[PDB]
Amino acid sequence: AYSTREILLALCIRDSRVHGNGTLHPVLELAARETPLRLSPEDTVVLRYHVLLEEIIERNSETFTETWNRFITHTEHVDLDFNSVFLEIFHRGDPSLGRALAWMAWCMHACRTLCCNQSTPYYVVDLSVRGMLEASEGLDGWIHQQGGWSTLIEDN
């Protein structure tokens, strides 16, 4: 199966290739080496999720823009706060398909906004990718109960 870390990272890379000038942030490329990403970002399962997550982003663009901007401008430890936010949604609340998709979409939007802005310090991209990827490991148990990332979107 695919871990949430793999799939989210594949998604950020995939999304990178269909935005901007297509180039890949060093922080992301290094993440693909260190995880190590075995899932291709051109994998059909990544293609589906990428289209879905972008649709969720569009439908909720004002919300995603205001929440992300508020988050990144007031954080003093963005990696820790990724874990804090996740916690509110998924430990102090029950996980659902809805909540999982919103979380993934929000993380992908986060990574796009950071990396499409060349004035963004590397350490910020570094801590943000670190944060969103560890917090997202928390879904593994739940989505495994649900049959995996591949099963969640394709069958139904």
Partner: peptide, 18 residues
Amino acid sequence: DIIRNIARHLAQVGDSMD
């Protein structure tokens, strides 16, 4: 309450999709 609120918005978007 920034983190709590952000998490609430995302909970709502998640819930509006169910």
